[PDB]
Amino acid sequence: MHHHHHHSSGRENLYFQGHMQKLFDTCKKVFADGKSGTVPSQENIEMLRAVLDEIKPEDVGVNPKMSYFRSTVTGRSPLVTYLHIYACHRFSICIFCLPPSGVIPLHNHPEMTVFSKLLFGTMHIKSYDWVPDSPQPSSDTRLAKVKVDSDFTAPCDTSILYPADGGNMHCFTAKTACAVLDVIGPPYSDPAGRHCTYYFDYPFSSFSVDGVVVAEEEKEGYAWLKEREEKPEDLTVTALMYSGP
Numbered sequence: 675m676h677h678h679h680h681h682s683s684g685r686e687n688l689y690f691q692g693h694m695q696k697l698f699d700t701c702k703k704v705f706a707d708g709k710s711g712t713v714p715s716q717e718n719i720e721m722l723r724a725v726l727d728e729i730k731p732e733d734v735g736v737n738p739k740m741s742y743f744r745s746t747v748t749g750r751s752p753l754v755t756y757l758h759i760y761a762c763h764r765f766s767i768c769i770f771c772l773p774p775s776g777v778i779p780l781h782n783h784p785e786m787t788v789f790s791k792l793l794f795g796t797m798h799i800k801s802y803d804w805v806p807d808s809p810q811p812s813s814d815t816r817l818a819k820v821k822v823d824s825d826f827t828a829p830c831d832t833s834i835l836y837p838a839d840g841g842n843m844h845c846f847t848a849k850t851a852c853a854v855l856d857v858i859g860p861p862y863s864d865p866a867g868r869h870c871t872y873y874f875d876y877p878f879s880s881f882s883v884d885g886v887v888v889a890e891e892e893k894e895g896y897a898w899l900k901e902r903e904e905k906p907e908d909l910t911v912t913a914l915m916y917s918g919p
C-alpha cells in the first residue's frame with residue numbers, strides 16, 4: 675500500500691539528528707543479519723522498541739495541523755499520505771498520515787517484523803494471526819485468531835508484530851487525525867515473494883467447516899479471512915515535494 679512508491683533505496687545522503695539519528699543507527703544494527711525474513715534477536719528487538727518508545731511526534735517533525743491530516747475526497751475514504759524516511763533491502767522507516775476515517779485495510783506482512791508507534795490521534799486496530807494447519811472452506815479463505823480489537827489514543831507505546839505472531843494481519847482505521855511511525859523489516863517486495871495481501875474478514879459463525887470445532891465462548895475470538903485483490907483505494911498517496919507559500 676506504499677511499496678509501489680518510487681524512492682531512493684539505500685540512499686547515501688541523509689540528515690537526521692537526536693532521536694531520529696538514534697533510530698536510524700539502531701535499525702541498521704537490528705536488521706542486518708541472517709537470510710531474508712530473519713526475525714532480529716530478542717535483545718535487538720528490545721533495544722529498538724526502547725528507542726521508538728522515547729519518540730514523540732515533534733521529534734520526527736509531524737503535527738496534526740499539517741495538510742496530510744485533512745482530506746476533502748468524497749465517494750471513498752480519505753487519502754492516506756505516505757512520508758518516506760528511509761528504506762533499504764533490510765528495513766524501511768516511514769510515517770503514515772491518516773485523516774479522520776482514513777483506513778489502511780486488512781493486510782498481512784509475510785516474513786516481516788514490524789514495529790509501530792501511534793504518534794498522535796485515536797486509531798482503531800484489528801489484528802489476527804493464522805491458525806496453523808487448519809481446514810479451509812475454500813483455497814482463498816483461512817481461519818484466524820483475533821489478537822487486537824481496540825481503540826488506541828496517543829500517547830501510546832510501540833507494538834511489534836512478527837511473521838507469524840503478534841498480529842501479522844491488521845487493519846488500521848483512524849477515528850481522529852493520526853500519524854503512525856512504522857519500522858518494517860524487511861519491506862514488502864514482489865520480486866522477493868513478499869507480496870502485500872489484502873483480506874475480507876468474517877465472523878467464525880459465517881463458515882461451518884468440517885474438522886473445525888470451536889467452543890461457544892471462544893467463537894468471538896476467531897474469524898475467517900478471505901484473500902482479495904488490491905484496489906486503488908487501498909493505496910497511500912505521495913506528499914507534495916514543494917508545499918508552496
Ligand SMILES: [Fe+3]
Nearest residue numbers: 781782783844
Ligand atoms: Fe501493516
Ligand code: NI
Nearest residue numbers: 675676677678
Ligand atoms: Ni505498498
